[PDB]
Amino acid sequence: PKEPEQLRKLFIGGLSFETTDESLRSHFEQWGTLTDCVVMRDPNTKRSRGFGFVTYATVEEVDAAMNARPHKVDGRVVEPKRAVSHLTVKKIFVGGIKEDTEEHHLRDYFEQYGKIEVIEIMTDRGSGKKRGFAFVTFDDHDSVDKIVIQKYHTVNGHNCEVRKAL
């Protein structure tokens, strides 16, 4: 059955004030079926508030739209973000990896969410022993947004806790 609507929505900031429901739809329909498409407007003046949202039929379509950034809509580069679960960060905390998880375990798993720039496996300041958690920094926030909405992360056979960092 259908993924929850919240996970199929993209909020689009930075719109041209000339963008309409129709022009936003014509743009974003290139990456999937849109079940909803709205430009937010002032209730009295009807002047655009400069943001809106689109709702796709599937999560894979959201992924396709995000992978097609940057989006220039009606002459202006816009800022799409998945709806909140916005705390826009590029770094995650990964906990529960114990002492046998290495850099390549984290890279092999997380590289499929986005381009990794830093992997930091935490070690004890005094002894050098692994503390059982790590931080991963990506080149872009959408990787993190995809990661933190998953119910489960299994890395090196460990069930991990993953959260947005800083």
Ligand SMILES: COc1cc(CN)cc(OC)c1OC
């Ligand atoms: C003004 O822009 C945004 C508005 C909302 C409203 N929920 C959410 C957003 O991101 C999830 C935005 O940034 C694109």
